[PDB]
Amino acid sequence: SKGNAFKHKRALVEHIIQAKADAQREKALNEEAEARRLKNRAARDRRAQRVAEKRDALLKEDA
Amino acid sequence: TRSSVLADALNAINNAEKTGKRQVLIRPSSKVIIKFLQVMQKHGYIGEFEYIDDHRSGKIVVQLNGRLNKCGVISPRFNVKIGDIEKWTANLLPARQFGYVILTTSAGIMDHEEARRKHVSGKILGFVY
Amino acid sequence: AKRTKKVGITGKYGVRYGSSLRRQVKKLEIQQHARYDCSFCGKKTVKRGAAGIWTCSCCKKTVAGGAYTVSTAAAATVRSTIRRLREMVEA
């Protein structure tokens, strides 16, 4: 605003509205991508210790 | 830096035969080089050659039977039509009867002789006589 | 924008007084009006009060310096050679 390109109050408010929505779409993907990184890789990381050394290897082929 | 491996390959073979060395080392020997040597080898200009298979594109040892005179490249690979190939042979070969002009084609890499018989053309890798 | 190609601070003089004279003042005037680093608080706040008086906006230490610079080249080398003389007396 000390530089030009905010010709009036409405121009500043409409720029803030755009910038806020731009960051709030940015934050929408930020939480969404952060969700998958926490979810998809990590949730089945316990599946390895769960099933990989559980079935088809130790119990059925034991007697 | 290195731009055409076959260019350096046949430039190395040319220097080898000129000095008369019966064997030469070629690298890094892409498969266009092997196909090129197959064309020459079956015709008898070169004899035995070994493709040392390391994981760095490999190297080639060629046995020169003292029969090759000059094998060159025509860079860039000019797109030659089925008709202009005779103009290319007449410009590049010491005589009509012998010598070969190597073309990579839809049907593979072969000399200008069976390029006519296959009735296929393409680019010009080089020549051998 | 880039308001002047070469005159810069001397542009206040308009067209008069000759280009060479205006060039000489343009050199000494940017050097006179620049903020300078302070030797006691370490922040670029030393301004020129009067010719030869260099007052820091903070810590209010005024240094006696050159007319158009905090430290002249001559004063700098004199300080060095006075130090050279005092090192041989003290060592």
Binding site: - | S75, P76, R77, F78 | -
Partner: protein
């Protein structure tokens, strides 16, 4: 090597490079700048009429020594005051001032031939009659 782009898609550079180096010619520069049409006594012609204004005794160059019997002819088509050689023996008695003569080139596209300084033309006809015929006395130059 060879200092020229042999790459398959280098056609643009080849043509531009050749098109700049064609300016180092003499003939091509003359043809493209039209120096015959612009700065030449003949506007790209082979022959041009004119008026013999006076006679010049043009001393030859070394090692020769002779008077070359040229004529100061001003060309009707552009007024240029050029000097024209007069071949064959005599033939300066055959022509006088305020005649009309047909000039031709001198055999070297400029660059006066022989031991003649600064004369790049030779007179072919005079009074509409061939100076060759006059030399052989077949015809007679009319007094017109």
């Amino acid at each position: 090597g060879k200092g020229k782009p042999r790459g398959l898609n280098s056609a643009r550079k080849l043509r531009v490079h050749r098109r700049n180096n064609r300016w180092a010619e003499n003939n091509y520069k003359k043809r493209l700048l039209g120096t015959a049409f612009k700065s030449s006594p003949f506007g790209g012609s082979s022959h041009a009429k004119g008026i013999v204004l006076e006679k010049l005794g043009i001393e030859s160059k070394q090692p020769n020594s002779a008077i070359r019997k040229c004529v100061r002819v001003q060309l009707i088509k552009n007024g240029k005051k050029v000097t024209a050689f007069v071949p064959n023996d005599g033939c300066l008695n055959f022509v006088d001032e305020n005649d009309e003569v047909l000039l031709a080139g001198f055999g070297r596209k400029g660059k006066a031939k022989g031991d003649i300084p600064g004369v790049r033309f030779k007179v072919v006809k005079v009074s509409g009659v061939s100076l060759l015929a006059l030399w052989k006395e077949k015809k007679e130059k009319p007094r017109s």
